[PDB]
Curated annotation (Swiss-Prot), chain B:
Disruption phenotype: Cells lacking this gene accumulate pupylated proteins. These cells also become hypersensitive to reactive nitrogen intermediates (RNI) and are severely attenuated in both wild-type and nitric oxide synthase 2 deficient mice. Moreover, they display increased resistance to hydrogen peroxide. It comes from Mycobacterium tuberculosis (strain ATCC 25618 / H37Rv). Belongs to the AAA ATPase family. Consists of three main regions, an N-terminal coiled-coil domain (residues 1-96) that binds to protein Pup and functions as a docking station, an interdomain (residues 97-245) involved in Mpa hexamerization, and a C-terminal ATPase domain of the AAA type (residues 246-609). ATPase which is responsible for recognizing, binding, unfolding and translocation of pupylated proteins into the bacterial 20S proteasome core particle. May be essential for opening the gate of the 20S proteasome via an interaction with its C-terminus, thereby allowing substrate entry and access to the site of proteolysis. Thus, the C-termini of the proteasomal ATPase may function like a 'key in a lock' to induce gate opening and therefore regulate proteolysis. Was identified as a natural substrate of the M.tuberculosis proteasome. Homohexamer. Assembles into a hexameric ring structure that caps the 20S proteasome core. Strongly interacts with the prokaryotic ubiquitin-like protein Pup through a hydrophobic interface; the interacting region of Mpa lies in its N-terminal coiled-coil domain. There is one Pup binding site per Mpa hexamer ring; the K(D) measured is about 3.8 uM. Upon ATP-binding, the C-terminus of Mpa interacts with the alpha-rings of the proteasome core, possibly by binding to the intersubunit pockets. Mpa thus promotes its own turnover. The chain holds residues 123 to 244 of 609 of the full protein. This is Proteasome-associated ATPase.
Length: 119, 105
């Protein structure tokens, strides 16, 4: 798996320059040549998809596009749970309200902060 | 400016053909054409039909006479030719495959 990060730096486009202009041709040729191999996979990430020229994004080479949307309330709760782990120390005042039930206290706190943020 | 030995035929010699010398500086034999050296991209063929303008590896352009085998098939701009800058001769054409035509169509 080859990971091309920040595809805005290179492979963006050749028309707007205001050799870097000779990067995408041979890369497209090499990708077309390696397409026949079954196990070779190319992965790319970019913040700005508009700067990338559609020639590399035509059906064929870059046939799959995946959009990562901004999190919503449920996604925010899941992300908070991914970090607010039970291993972090919890003050006795909040913990006593749940009779030592760490998981219940943590999940209630996660729901409360998610509701506070999206209000 | 060397003199030709009576053994060899002066008219039989071809332009750009490598020749053999000796301690008396007399050409007694003529060999084949050189097969190793710099490769230059052809830019254009001059009006005289005997000299061509090519570009070197370092973007340095030169005017060099063409060898006898180069004087169907027609030479075209973009072809790669074996050259000798010191002697100012192009001896052979090195075939190259272009992928641009395949990509475009």
């Amino acid at each position: 798996i080859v990971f091309f990060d920040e595809m805005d730096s290179i492979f963006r486009t050749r028309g707007t320059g205001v050799v870097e202009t000779t990067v995408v041709p041979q890369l497209l040729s090499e990708i077309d040549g390696v397409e026949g191999l079954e196990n070779v996979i190319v992965i790319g990430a970019s913040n700005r998809e508009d700067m990338i020229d559609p020639a590399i994004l035509r059906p064929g080479r870059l046939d799959v596009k995946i959009k990562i949307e901004r999190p919503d309330a449920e996604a925010a709760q899941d992300i908070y749970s991914k970090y607010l782990t039970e291993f972090l120390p919890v003050h006795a005042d909040d913990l006593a309200e749940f009779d030592g039930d760490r998981s219940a206290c943590i999940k209630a706190m996660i729901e409360k902060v998610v509701d506070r943020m999206y209000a | 400016r060397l003199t030709c030995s009576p053994n060899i035929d002066a008219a039989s010699l071809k332009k750009g053909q490598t020749v053999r010398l000796n301690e008396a500086l007399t050409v007694v034999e003529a060999g084949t054409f050189e097969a190793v050296g710099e490769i230059s991209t052809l830019r254009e063929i001059l009006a005289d039909g005997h000299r061509a303008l090519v570009v070197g590896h370092a973007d340095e352009e030169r005017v060099v006479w063409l060898a006898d085998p180069l004087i169907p098939r027609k030479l075209r701009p973009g072809d790669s030719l074996l050259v000798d800058t010191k002697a100012g001769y192009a001896f052979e054409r090195i075939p190259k495959a272009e992928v641009e035509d395949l990509v475009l169509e």
